[PDB]
Amino acid sequence: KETAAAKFERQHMDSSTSAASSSNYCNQMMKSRNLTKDRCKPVNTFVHESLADVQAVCSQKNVACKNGQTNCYQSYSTMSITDCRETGSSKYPNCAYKTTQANKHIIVACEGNPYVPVHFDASV
Template sequence: MASHGNERLPLCFGGENLSWVPVRDSSSRLAEPLRRDQKFWKEHHNERSSDQEVQKQMRQINLGKKKCKHINTIIHDQQDKIRDICTNPNSKNVLCKNGWDNCFQGPNTYSVTVCLEKPNSQPGKCLYDCTKVEPAKVTVACENGKPVHLDDAIVHVVM
């Protein structure tokens, strides 16, 4: 894909656009786009689960976007335990919501926080009602042994 001067053309990967992050490096050029696995960690992982930390993460997710993300789920656990969903032989291979076959439901449960956009939310001032839920089964899409998309988080009642 050709780039002319400072113009940036949309970059596609696996049928989905990568996200351009409006961050400048020391040379004042736009930073490279986040890879799908980096975007997954930015949007869906935070070992801290305080409301303040989750709200801060939601602000960062929406920074520079033209619309607020309507719903987002954040998994509260160590990265290696979440990454394990893609490589654990006990993970269940399930059909993704988009029809692809690269989704896996991990054998373990996690603590998650689900954030829903409030009706009075607007770009630049995105507001959320967030609820911590546990235990939840998590399904992720995997590429090269790494999670790249949170496909589902199902709350299970454990007795």
């Protein structure tokens, strides 16, 4: 199966672009990153920073994760992110999303050797 690190890159990294430039970005990316094959994933965030910059977050401020686990890390700097939120009329298989671009601190859960992001927890 996909490694946890590779799954995080597929589901949450978009280093190719600095921001989402179209209101259809989430419709396109949720589909193209295989997040709508099994069901419409209701919410997902993509990070528009280099992989190195996101991996570096695992060496930044330790915080709790929303589920109460304690291996989360908050970025020192804000990062470009796109939040994808499923619309009210969305119905599988035509999963439809609202795209919101913002510049916020991110919180990721980190694991492994090398110690890298494995879950996207939150932004603030």
